[PDB]
């Protein structure tokens, strides 16, 4: 799948999930390299540090 699954995910409470895309990368100059990389885009919930610092 083009994204990671959240079918059995329990929410964090201090970090918010935004996007979890995955991509398959190849190196044109190597030809023996391959990997799958997932970007975890996470958004902080700022109330705690707002209250405690700002």
């Amino acid at each position, epitope marked *: *799948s083009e*994204v990671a699954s*959240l079918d059995d995910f329990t*929410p964090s409470g201090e970090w*918010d*999930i*935004v*996007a*979890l895309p995955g991509r398959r990368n190849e190196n044109p100059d190597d030809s023996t390299y391959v990997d799958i990389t997932y970007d975890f*885009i996470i958004r902080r919930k700022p109330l705690f540090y707002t209250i405690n610092l700002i």
Partner: antibody
Amino acid sequence: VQLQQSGAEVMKPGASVKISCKGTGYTFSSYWIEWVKQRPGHGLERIGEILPGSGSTNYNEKFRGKATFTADKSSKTAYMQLSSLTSEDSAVYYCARYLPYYYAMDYWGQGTSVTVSS
Amino acid sequence: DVLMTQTPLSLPVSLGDQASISCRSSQSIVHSNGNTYLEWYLQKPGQSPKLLIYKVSNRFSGVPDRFSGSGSGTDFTLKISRVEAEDLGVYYCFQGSHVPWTFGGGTKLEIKR
């Protein structure tokens, strides 16, 4: 992939609505569902979005309190709840699939028509 | 919320004429990663909106090549080179950069004769 919305609805002012968008053919839990309102006059207005995988939800300024989103993990469907209804809410509501900062709104629902009158 | 403004509210242009739609934002909508997330949609009457362009420099798959976008942090423009009857509808801006994401005001397109 297919996004399936509920059928049209007619109800009196002051009632509450619960329209649903059901998606199939992709990882439902990992996409933001964007709810868009289109008054018959003109203009597309975005009510908010929900991420079925978690409870995350965002509402536009004009719709806070007016609308409320909910999702079911087991059944690939998400619900929008409308608070005390009025004649101004008479419009057609859309559901779309969105992944922020990457490919965007490539699939939409058919559209649900909600009309309010006595 | 970021406010997106589209002009002109109408653009009657005969077939084969270049059509340009302007889009302006209350704030800059450039993102930290180096990209700016602006999307263009087309809603024909009686149909749901259709995606046309995203990350304006880019373009969606399946749409014809006559479409193209460009712009800086606050000013963006969509361009249609050679119009037809299948390009009739309402074009909307959509900024995906700053939460909450908001739509443009829309701009009806007509053909002048």
